[PDB]
């Protein structure tokens, strides 16, 4: 059963064990060593690390699990970086497709791919920002796809 | 059938060994009864024990009963 | 667990061996 | 033997015969191309089958297609 | 090709006599390179099963005498190259 | 004669041809219609005897390229001196070296990886050095951070002189070929000028820097009371206290009373019992011996003054009867073909690097080097590995000579091709020696494997069982015990303490123990002779069958990196002189993997470890070699199962980056097999079946996406098999010995 | 038909099958494969320059 | 003059873009480390 | 339980059967 | 060996004593006037024909195939002219009517002793 992670026992056992275990090296230095300040910053980055995983679900393992159902209580877990990611490589993919359908109609398409025309490249890098309703409106013209390309025997 | 007497305890034996390469020290690393047989890791005594073979005699009549069938095929 | 049943078995698979070599030199 | 067959795509550019280091291939005057030539493979008893012809066959797809057939002494290329 | 299989013993003259009288004392042999060997083979020659790895002047003056003796007989066949 | 004719303003220096990739090859300036142009661009980036046959233009290109290599090496050493300066704990390491583990690289604090900063002491953390730079700096006498900064900045200065030198010697002053075929002068300046003045000037550094400094650090002086090497030459008085022969000046040198220089120079050998290194009196005396001996050596090549040899009149004079012509032609081979010179120099360079490894483990020449065992391990191992690869470079570039630059007119009946007349009798007897040593080097391991597995340990090859005591190695090692009284008359100790007397300990750490060789060490030496003979088989089969085999009698007409001939002759895959080098790299991995698996486990059983009270002994595995190296279950269990345990439990600690470079190197090793086993007849229409999925969405790439070629599609399987395979033993070894030593 | 015309192929072992290409030379001397067609892209032989018959001569407009 | 063509090639712009997005990941993981939400 | 039969049958199938089977098969290359 | 395998003896003439390379290996003496040369297999021999012909003129050359019965053969050339050059004596064998695209499917050839292209 996925307990809420802020109250799970083995979670806070890992809190005591890692703050104490990393803290064992912190007594190897004086009060004004640069390493001692670095492990001050590291202990801060462990208490923040465990307070910022409060609303997750760590089960009996004491390790924060995830949920990928789109439950809308786990939306910040999976689906918000899911839609975020699909926007980012939809950006990248529409940039690359748009640049290849640029260099397909140029003088010499071979030299276009070694030496990227950074004018027209950085045109398409930035212009491919709104690929759902630009790739979709280039799909409604019947132009994202193709037909009767290369194939083997049958 | 010694395994049928004690199914949890006794480790089930496969066929026996005749190595002329076992000098002495390996011969004491296999003694499960008088034979030095391999422990049978194939679940066959469990299937023959749910079948209800509780004997070695029924296994001989079965072994003859499949030499007959192999000769038939 | 007995003795003569083993001999009955090796006779029956000797016959089965002759039927195997009888299948061998015809196909 | 390794059966060499030379189809009607053979436009007679003769990189095949120059590419064969066995002289299984020769050129035959054949009035069906612009050069008037079409290659022939009469002596396939010496044909290794190394497909060095098919590398240097600049047709559409392989006018000369080597099919790997029999394996004699000469067609296996063993020295002894 | 070996047209001159003439002499071998000229190396035995040529390698023992150049290595007998120079003693050069504080090494294994206080005597020369060969005198420390001929004395240290006659103790072992009469079918002695001994001579272990700690037998110094048998093994060491075995190899160091054979390695110059081989070299001087080979150079003796090089002594039939100027013909 | 000797004269230097130099073309000026050879090549203009605009960035125009950088915009033309593949400008250099007219076979490759067509531009990429396929993606194989991308990889052929890099496979022809240094085929200098494939750009143009004109050896002048080639020779300018290579000779300018060497300065680029030395520029990268001076950037590398300037990097090591700066990471020694700003980032290392070397100043604190100089106080107590046996307690402080050496660290330079201080990992930047991003997510997690700040835990790699190992608290190695010195008050400052960071990942631990295994390269052994601090031992060479204590030997060289670098006291504080200032010489590391300044020597780093001089490293960048020489890097600028090598970039400017290479630009200067390709573009605006580049020589003729008559400069290059003036090779008696080249040997005449490299024997004498490079190595002679190198060892002589280094004897200057050791006598006027290291002998006072590593006398004071041997006396245990803190690195603040130590004066600068500066201050030992303003007056002889600070050195006459340390070495009282400096008071006499150079006067006993010029009168040849060299008995007086017993303070500065001696012949003692052994090791320093205090620092665990060689005596720098012996090392400075040694570099004087290389000094005078190489300056003698340089002057045997007639250049202008009619005094000295020429190589032609040497090689003609050995007109032996069983070779017929003698060495006629080799001065014309080695001064017209670069690849043959690269074969010789990579063979001797690689075998020198192996010699470096074997001379560094047993005579540890740096102070406190044998104390920290990871620097003792990885400087054996690293120089063993480059010392391996360079021999395969000999086996390749010998074949690149034999395919390209062979000409039978200059090379007719001499010592060279008379081998190739009976190369069947060469390779056939290598075949026999490989089978005989494989049976008698590994069949003994299957024997002891079975006899230990069959219970009958009375039939093994142990010391208790049928023994195979190495007779010859124990005998000559016993001679090396008896050296410094008998034959090395003016010595005191032996050539090493791998030979003779009782062990040398520094800080309760065993610096060197006399290595015992009994009946297991024997069989591993026959492993090494075996897998050396197999690489010699593949790398002589790669050269004698390079140009014209009896399978394929025109390979020079096909080239060097051709994949094959075809399915004819029943299949002629992998038959080129390059493909034997493809095989010799796997056998390089085998041969050196069991060299270092002999090293790092015999010396974790027979040498290294600690010493306790009353001089009592303790090894790391605890004498667990001769009862365990005889089998393979003892080898795999007791070595690869047991020594892995400090690499595998290394998580949550500073050794966990080796726990990442262990698994990832298993990944790269396993990832090579995809390239080795399959071939482009699969991947080309797998890829083209993906090209359908780009042609459907108009994402057809204009450079056509081929698969790799065959030779690239096996060269990359080598270069992953070796990167993953070598980095496994890398992470395993450094995570093993850092975790204890 | 003519030189310079942009021609789709209908032969399944053409590498450029169902891809248009430009006509370079046509011979009218009963050569069985007279219409030499080269292409933008490149087969595995490295060679765009091939030739075809008249049944595999389908142009576009 | 033609250096900017060399700074428009495939590997150089590959390093000047993967170096840049690499710096986006590292500079976005120094400022907000341990980011499993959102 | 005839405890002597593997002492006969294990060697005569283990070694001497791949002698006569080498003869029957290997001469049966030419028969 | 020579008592059971077809030795290939290559006979040719030259003008000057040059030096070529054997297919067995190494440099050969190359008798200037006329010289025969026993070999092992045909690719060695025509590889030597490429070895000499692409360098310089070695014409009036052909291997007499010593088959072990005792007599010879003659292949390169037969009509006296070089094979990629076109002579009006050679009869072409080894063709079909079209490309591979009209070759028969091997399920139409299954259980018959035919080829995948004869039709
Ligand atoms: C122009 C950019 C671009 C675009 C839009 C696509 C799109 C596609 N590829 Mg892909 N691909 C690309 C480049 C691209 N590819 C490159 C450069 C390679 C070589 C590494 C591949 C190798 C590849 C394989 C092997 C496969 C696909 C497949 C696919 C399809 C499924 C999506 C997927 O998993 O992608 C796969 C994505 C990758 C393998 C990694 C992405 C490739 C690079 C890193 C990103 C591309 C950005 C591009 C370089 C930007 C250049 C332009 C810009 C400078 C102006 C999809 C149509 C699959 C398919 O057929 O599915 C139907 C498939 O099996 N691709
Ligand atoms: C005694 C003079 C001398 C010295 C010291 C060297 C030293 C070297 N030569 Mg060299 N060489 C010389 C004479 C000399 N050469 C002559 C006379 C010829 C012509 C026959 C050549 C032909 C030659 C070739 C063809 C090659 C070398 C290479 C090398 C380098 C090997 C790499 C190495 O050891 O790095 C250790 C590095 C050092 C020890 C640094 C050395 C720098 C010091 C300052 C000496 C350099 C002085 C310089 C040569 C004087 C030029 C005069 C000019 C300024 C007016 C090394 C720097 C190889 C190389 O890498 O190319 C550069 C190479 O391929 N040499
Ligand atoms: C008297 C001068 C002298 C001194 C003090 C040293 C001292 C040293 N050398 Mg040495 N060396 C010398 C001369 C000298 N060498 C000469 C002249 C050569 C070239 C032949 C070498 C070649 C050499 C190698 C290859 C190695 C050393 C190494 C070492 C170190 C190991 C410690 C030891 O016990 O070695 C004592 C040294 C010796 C027993 C060498 C004696 C060499 C004699 C002087 C050669 C005489 C030359 C002459 C032509 C005779 C040659 C044939 C002869 C054998 C019959 C030590 C610092 C090892 C090292 O690097 O340490 C890690 C190592 O691997 N040396
Ligand atoms: C572990 C796998 C393995 C093994 C055992 C071998 C073994 C061998 N390789 Mg090798 N090889 C391997 C992997 C392996 N290779 C891989 C992965 C590559 C990839 C690059 C190569 C590439 C390679 C090349 C390129 C060459 C070899 C060659 C050889 C042979 C060297 C001669 C020798 O040692 O004979 C001794 C044999 C052994 C040690 C094998 C064990 C034999 C035991 C000891 C005795 C017999 C067992 C048993 C009694 C048999 C009877 C019972 C049975 C009949 C029922 C040897 C058989 C060379 C060759 O052709 O031979 C010279 C050669 O040129 N190998
Ligand atoms: C190749 C390495 C090797 C070697 C050297 C041995 C050696 C041995 N094994 Mg063995 N073994 C090996 C591999 C090897 N094994 C492997 C790989 C396996 C597993 C497959 C086994 C499995 C095995 C078992 C199961 C047993 C042994 C046993 C033995 C011992 C007796 C065998 C015997 O009678 O020899 C027979 C020897 C010969 C017939 C001699 C032939 C070779 C001669 C010397 C060649 C001489 C040629 C000559 C030099 C030509 C030059 C001179 C001429 C020109 C005049 C013997 C020590 C037995 C034992 O009890 O150990 C004590 C035993 O029970 N082995
Ligand atoms: C063949 C093996 C061998 C080797 C490697 C050496 C090596 C050496 N001997 Mg030596 N020596 C040998 C046999 C050998 N010796 C024998 C057989 C004798 C007896 C004739 C001597 C008598 C001898 C003397 C008398 C001296 C050397 C010295 C030396 C050292 C200086 C280099 C040199 O000889 O000049 C060098 C380590 C010299 C030395 O100890 O200086 C370090 C020295 O004075 N040797
Ligand atoms: C090309 C990638 C890249 C990008 C986008 C940034 C972006 C940024 N860096 Mg930066 N940085 C980079 C590479 C990059 N850096 C590299 C390679 C280094 C090492 C030399 C640094 C070293 C660095 C420092 C030392 C600092 C920044 C800082 C900053 C921020 C100031 C605005 C900004 C987010 C500043 C900041 O806000 O950090 C606190 C700052 O102080 N950067
Ligand atoms: C492909 C599989 C995969 C996936 C889905 C993830 C996913 C994740 N990894 Mg990751 N990782 C992977 C493979 C993967 N990793 C591999 C193979 C390695 C070994 C090299 C790592 C090593 C690694 C480390 C060392 C760390 C992560 C972390 C993370 C988390 C945050 C990433 C980050 O930097 O966000 C922050 C970045 C952004 C917010 C930038 C996006 C902003 C966009 C570009 C702006 C424009 C949008 C409009 C995230 C859950 C981090 C973590 O805390 O784990 C939970 C972390 O510290 N990973
Ligand atoms: C080394 C001893 C070899 C004796 C050969 C003596 C020798 O080389 O004499 C030199 C002789 C060449 O005779 P020539 O008088 O012509 O030599 C002068 C000329 O070579 C110089 O132009 O070479 C041979 O006869 C080749 C025989 C190789 C036969 C195989 C030998 C290699 C097997 C031994 C491998 C062992 C290596 C480990 C060494 C322990
Ligand atoms: C997988 C495989 C391939 C396919 C390998 C493909 C073709 C290469 C994949 C890696 C390249 C580098 C991808 C190209 C991507 C570019 C780097 C652009 C990406 C954008 C940035 C990363 C720069 C072979 O070609 C092959 C050939 C012969 C034997 C075995 C194999 C084989 O196993
Ligand atoms: S087929 Fe290709 S190679 Fe053979 S001749 Fe016609 S064109 Fe030249
Ligand atoms: S098959 Fe081998 S030999 Fe016969 S032609 Fe094609 S390539 Fe030349």
């Amino acid at each position: 059963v996925l307990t809420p992670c802020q109250q799970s026992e083995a979670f806070h056992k890992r809190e005591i064990n890692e703050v104490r275990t990393l803290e064992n090296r912190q007594a190897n230095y004086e009060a004004n060593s640069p390493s001692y300040l670095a492990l001050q910053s590291q202990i801060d980055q462990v208490h923040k690390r465990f307070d910022k995983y409060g609303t997750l679900l760590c089960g009996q393992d004491g390790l924060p699990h995830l949920i990928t159902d789109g439950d809308w209580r786990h939306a910040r877990e999976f689906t918000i970086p899911a839609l975020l990611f699909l926007y980012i490589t939809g950006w990248i993919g529409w940039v690359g497709r748009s640049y290849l359908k640029y260099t397909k109609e140029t003088k010499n398409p071979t030299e276009q791919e070694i030496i990227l025309d950074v004018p027209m490249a950085l045109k398409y890098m930035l212009s491919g920002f709104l690929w759902p309703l630009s790739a979709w409106q280039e799909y409604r013209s019947g132009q994202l796809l193709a037909k009767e390309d290369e194939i083997t025997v049958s | 059938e010694q395994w049928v007497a004690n199914p949890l305890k006794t480790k089930p034996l496969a066929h026996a060994i005749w190595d002329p390469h076992f000098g002495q020290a390996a011969l004491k690393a296999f003694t499960r009864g008088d034979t030095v047989a391999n422990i049978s890791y194939s679940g066959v005594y469990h299937w023959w024990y749910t079948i209800g073979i509780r004997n070695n005699v029924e296994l001989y009549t079965g072994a003859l009963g499949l030499l007959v069938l192999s000769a038939v095929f | 667990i007995t003795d003569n049943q083993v001999f009955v078995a090796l006779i029956m698979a000797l016959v089965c061996g002759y039927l195997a070599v009888k299948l061998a030199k015809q196909l | 033997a390794h059966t060499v067959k030379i189809y009607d795509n053979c436009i007679g550019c003769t990189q095949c015969v120059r590419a064969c280091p066995l002289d299984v291939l020769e050129m035959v005057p054949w009035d069906g191309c612009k050069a008037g030539q079409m290659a022939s493979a009469p002596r396939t008893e010496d044909c290794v089958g190394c497909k060095r012809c098919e590398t240097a066959c600049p047709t559409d797809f392989l006018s000369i297609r080597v099919y790997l057939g029999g394996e004699t002494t000469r067609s296996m290329g063993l020295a002894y | 090709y070996p047209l001159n299989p003439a002499v071998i013993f000229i190396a035995l003259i040529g390698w023992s006599a150049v290595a007998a009288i120079p003693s050069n004392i504080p090494v294994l042999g206080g005597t020369g390179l060969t005198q420390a060997f001929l004395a240290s083979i006659q103790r072992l020659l009469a079918q002695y099963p001994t001579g272990p790895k700690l037998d110094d002047p048998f093994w060491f003056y075995l190899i160091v005498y054979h390695v110059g003796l081989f070299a001087l007989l080979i150079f003796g066949q090089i002594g039939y190259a100027g013909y | 004669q000797v004269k230097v004719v130099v073309d000026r303003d050879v090549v203009p220096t605009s960035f125009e041809k950088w915009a033309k990739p593949g400008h250099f090859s007219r076979s490759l300036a067509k531009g990429p219609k396929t993606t194989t142009w991308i990889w052929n661009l890099h496979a022809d980036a240094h085929d200098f005897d494939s750009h143009t046959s004109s050896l002048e233009e080639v020779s300018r290109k290579i000779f300018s390229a060497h300065f680029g290599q030395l520029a990268i090496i001076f950037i590398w050493l300037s990097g090591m001196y700066f990471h020694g300066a700003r980032f290392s704990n070397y100043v604190a390491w100089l106080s107590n070296p046996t307690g402080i583990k050496p660290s330079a690289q201080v990992v930047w604090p991003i997510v997690g990886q700040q835990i790699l900063n190992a608290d190695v002491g010195g008050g400052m953390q960071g990942i631990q050095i295994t390269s052994g730079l601090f031992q060479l700096w204590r030997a060289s006498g670098i006291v504080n951070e200032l010489q590391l900064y300044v020597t780093a900045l001089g490293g960048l200065g020489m890097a600028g002189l090598m970039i400017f030198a290479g630009w200067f010697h390709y573009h605006k002053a580049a020589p003729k070929l008559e400069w290059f075929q003036n090779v008696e002068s080249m040997l005449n300046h490299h024997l004498a000028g490079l190595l002679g003045l190198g060892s002589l000037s280094w004897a200057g550094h050791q006598i006027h820097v290291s002998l006072p400094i590593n006398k004071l650090l041997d006396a245990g002086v803190a690195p603040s009371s130590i004066p600068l090497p500066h201050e030992f030459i303003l007056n002889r008085n600070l050195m006459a206290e340390l070495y009282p022969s400096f008071q006499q000046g150079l006067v006993p040198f010029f009168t040849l009373n060299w008995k007086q220089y017993s303070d500065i120079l001696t012949f003692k050998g052994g090791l320093s019992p205090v620092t665990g290194g060689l005596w720098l009196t012996d090392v400075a005396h040694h570099h004087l011996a290389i000094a005078v001996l190489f300056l003698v050596a340089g002057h045997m090549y007639r250049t202008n003054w009619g005094i000295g040899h020429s190589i032609k009149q040497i090689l003609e004079a050995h007109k032996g009867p069983l070779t017929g012509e003698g060495h006629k032609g080799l001065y014309e081979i080695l001064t017209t073909s670069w690849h043959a010179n690269l074969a010789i120099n990579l063979a001797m360079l690689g075998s020198l690097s192996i010699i470096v490894a074997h001379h560094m483990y047993a005579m540890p020449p740096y102070p406190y080097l044998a104390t920290d065992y990871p620097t003792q391990l990885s400087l054996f191992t690293h120089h063993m590995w480059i010392g391996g690869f360079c021999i395969v470079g000999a086996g390749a570039h010998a074949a690149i000579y034999m395919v390209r630059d062979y000409s039978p007119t200059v090379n007719f009946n001499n010592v060279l091709d008379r081998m190739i007349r009976h190369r069947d009798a060469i390779i056939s007897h290598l075949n026999w020696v490989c089978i005989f040593l494989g049976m008698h080097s590994f069949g003994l391991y299957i024997h002891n494997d079975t006899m230990r597995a069959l219970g009958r340990a009375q039939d093994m090859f142990s010391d208790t069982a049928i023994q195979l005591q190495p007779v010859f190695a124990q005998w000559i090692q016993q001679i090396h015990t008896l050296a410094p009284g008998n034959t090395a008359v003016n010595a005191l100790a032996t050539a090493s303490y791998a030979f003779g007397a009782d062990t040398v300990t520094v800080g309760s750490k065993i610096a060197m123990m006399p290595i015992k060789l009994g009946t297991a060490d024997f069989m591993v030496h026959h492993i090494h002779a075996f897998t050396i003979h197999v690489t010699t088989l593949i790398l002589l089969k790669g050269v004698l069958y390079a140009r014209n085999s009896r399978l394929i009698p025109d390979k020079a007409n096909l080239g060097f990196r051709f994949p094959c001939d075809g399915p004819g002759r029943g299949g002629t895959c992998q038959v080129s002189a390059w493909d034997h080098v493809f095989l010799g790299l796997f056998w390089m991995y085998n041969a050196l993997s069991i060299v270092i698996f002999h090293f790092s486990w015999k010396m974790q059983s027979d040498v290294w470890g600690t010493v306790t009270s009353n001089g009592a002994i303790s090894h790391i595995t605890g004498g667990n070699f001769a009862q365990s190296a005889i089998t393979i279950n003892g080898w795999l269990r007791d070595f690869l199962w047991a020594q892995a345990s400090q690499v595998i439990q290394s998580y949550g600690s500073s050794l966990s980056a080796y726990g990442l470079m262990f698994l990832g190197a298993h990944f790269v090793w396993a990832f090579s097999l995809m390239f080795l086993f399959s071939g482009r007849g699969y991947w080309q229409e797998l890829i083209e079946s993906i090209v359908w999925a780009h042609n459907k969405l108009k994402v057809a790439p204009a450079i056509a996406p081929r698969a790799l070629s065959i030779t690239q599609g096996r060269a990359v399987g080598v270069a992953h098999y070796l990167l993953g395979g070598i980095a496994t033993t890398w992470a395993f070894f450094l995570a093993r010995i850092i975790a204890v030593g | 038909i003519k030189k310079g015309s942009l021609v789709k192929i209908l032969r399944p072992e053409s590498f450029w099958y169902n891809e248009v290409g430009t006509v370079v030379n046509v011979e009218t001397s009963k050569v069985l494969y007279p219409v030499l067609v080269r292409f933008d892209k490149v087969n595995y032989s490295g060679l765009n320059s091939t030739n075809f018959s008249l049944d595999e001569l389908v142009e576009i407009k | 003059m033609n250096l900017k063509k060399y700074l428009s090639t495939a590997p150089v712009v590959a390093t000047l873009w993967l170096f840049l997005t690499a710096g986006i990941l590292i500079e976005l993981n120094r400022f907000f480390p341990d980011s499993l939400f959102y | 339980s005839a405890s002597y039969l593997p002492s006969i049958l294990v060697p005569t199938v283990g070694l001497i059967l791949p002698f006569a089977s080498m003869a029957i098969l290997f001469i049966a290359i030419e028969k | 060996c020579a008592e059971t395998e077809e030795k290939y003896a290559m006979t040719w003439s030259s003008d000057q004593q040059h030096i070529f390379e054997m297919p067995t290996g190494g440099a050969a003496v190359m008798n200037s006037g006329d010289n025969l040369l026993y070999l092992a297999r045909k690719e060695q021999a025509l590889a030597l024909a490429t070895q000499l012909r692409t360098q310089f003129k070695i014409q009036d050359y052909k291997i007499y195939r010593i088959f072990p019965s005792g007599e010879v053969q003659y292949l390169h050339p037969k009509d006296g002219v070089l094979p990629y050059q076109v002579n009006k004596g050679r009869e072409q064998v080894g063709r079909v009517k079209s490309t591979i695209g009209k070759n028969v499917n091997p399920a139409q050839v299954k259980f018959t002793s035919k080829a995948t292209y004869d039709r």
Side-chain angles (χ1 to χ4, degrees), chain A residues 25 28-29 33 35 42 45 96-97 100 103-104 109-110 113-115 143-146 149-150, chain F residues 19 21 32-33 37 114-115 117-119 123 125 688 692 695-703:
Chain A
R25 297 180 69 190
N28 203 3
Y29 298 102
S33 178
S35 62
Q42 192 165 4
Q45 287 181 355
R97 182 184 183 274
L100 285 182
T103 63
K104 190 180 293 296
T110 67
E113 316 305 328
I114 300 165
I115 298 171
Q143 197 173 2
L144 178 60
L145 301 178
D149 52 355
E150 293 181 352
Chain F
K33 305 301 289 184
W37 185 84
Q114 56 189 353
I115 205 63
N117 288 315
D119 47 356
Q125 70 279 19
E688 193 172 4
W692 184 80
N695 284 314
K696 185 65 190 297
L697 290 176
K698 298 287 188 181
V699 201
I703 297 177

Side-chain angles (χ1 to χ4, degrees), chain E residues 22-24 26-27 33 60-61 64 67, chain F residues 267 486-491:
Chain E
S23 68
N24 203 355
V27 302
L33 284 77
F60 179 67
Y61 292 105
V64 79
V67 75
Chain F
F267 188 85
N486 295 113
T487 60
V489 176
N490 293 319

Side-chain angles (χ1 to χ4, degrees), chain F residues 108 314 413 553 682:
Chain F
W108 275 344
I314 295 171
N413 202 0
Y682 174 79

Side-chain angles (χ1 to χ4, degrees), chain E:
Chain E
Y1 298 100
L3 191 65
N4 292 318
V7 286
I8 303 169
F9 290 163
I10 195 168
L12 290 171
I13 301 169
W15 179 248
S16 65
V18 303
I21 54 169
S23 68
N24 203 355
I25 299 98
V27 302
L28 287 84
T31 63
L33 284 77
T34 65
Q35 189 64 257
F37 181 71
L38 275 73
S40 296
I41 56 171
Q42 61 190 0
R43 55 97 180 267
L44 196 143
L45 181 59
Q47 194 56 253
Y48 285 89
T50 64
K53 299 285 101 181
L54 57 93
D55 193 1
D56 301 332
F58 181 74
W59 291 103
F60 179 67
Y61 292 105
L62 188 155
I63 292 294
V64 79
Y65 183 80
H66 290 87
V67 75
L69 182 55
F70 283 161
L72 209 149
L73 63 89
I74 285 172
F75 288 166
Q77 291 299 108
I78 304 302
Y80 294 97
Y83 300 103

Side-chain angles (χ1 to χ4, degrees), chain F residues 48-189:
Chain F
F48 284 184
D49 288 335
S50 174
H51 294 91
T52 305
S53 67
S54 67
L55 190 63
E56 298 185 353
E57 196 272 336
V58 177
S59 186
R60 293 182 181 94
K61 285 174 69 167
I62 166 195
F63 176 71
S64 180
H66 288 280
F67 293 103
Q69 177 61 257
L70 295 178
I72 294 173
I73 296 167
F74 279 116
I75 289 170
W76 177 66
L77 286 180
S78 65
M80 300 304 106
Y81 289 154
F82 183 72
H83 284 279
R86 180 68 179 170
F87 281 175
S88 72
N89 58 359
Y90 172 69
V91 180
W93 181 79
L94 195 59
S95 298
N96 45 358
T98 61
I100 289 177
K101 296 181 289 295
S103 70
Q105 190 186 10
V106 178
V107 177
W108 275 344
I110 316 171
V111 284
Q113 70 166 355
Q114 56 189 353
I115 205 63
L116 301 179
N117 288 315
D119 47 356
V120 295
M124 184 177 71
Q125 70 279 19
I127 191 63
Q128 174 169 354
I129 296 169
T130 62
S131 67
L133 291 174
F134 290 179
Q135 285 81 16
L136 192 144
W137 298 346
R138 187 183 175 94
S140 181
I142 295 169
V143 177
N144 54 5
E145 65 181 1
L146 182 61
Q147 303 95 18
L148 294 174
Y149 282 107
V150 169
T151 314
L153 188 60
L156 292 176
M158 292 301 293
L161 289 176
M162 295 304 170
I163 291 172
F164 175 71
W167 175 65
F168 185 77
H169 281 277
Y170 188 68
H171 291 277
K172 296 189 188 294
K176 293 284 184 64
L177 185 61
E178 294 178 354
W179 186 69
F180 285 96
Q181 294 181 357
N182 200 351
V183 179
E184 296 91 4
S185 61
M186 193 175 293
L187 288 169
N188 195 354
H189 300 85

Side-chain angles (χ1 to χ4, degrees), chain B residues 28-51:
Chain B
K28 296 295 182 181
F30 292 103
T31 59
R32 294 171 179 86
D34 286 329
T35 59
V36 291
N38 295 318
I39 299 168
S40 179
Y41 303 109
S42 57
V44 177
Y45 294 12
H46 301 277
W47 172 51
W48 289 348
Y49 182 67
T50 54
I51 279 171

Side-chain angles (χ1 to χ4, degrees), chain F residues 681-701:
Chain F
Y682 174 79
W683 297 99
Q684 184 64 50
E685 75 268 12
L686 180 65
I687 279 170
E688 193 172 4
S689 67
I690 302 170
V691 179
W692 184 80
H694 294 85
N695 284 314
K696 185 65 190 297
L697 290 176
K698 298 287 188 181
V699 201

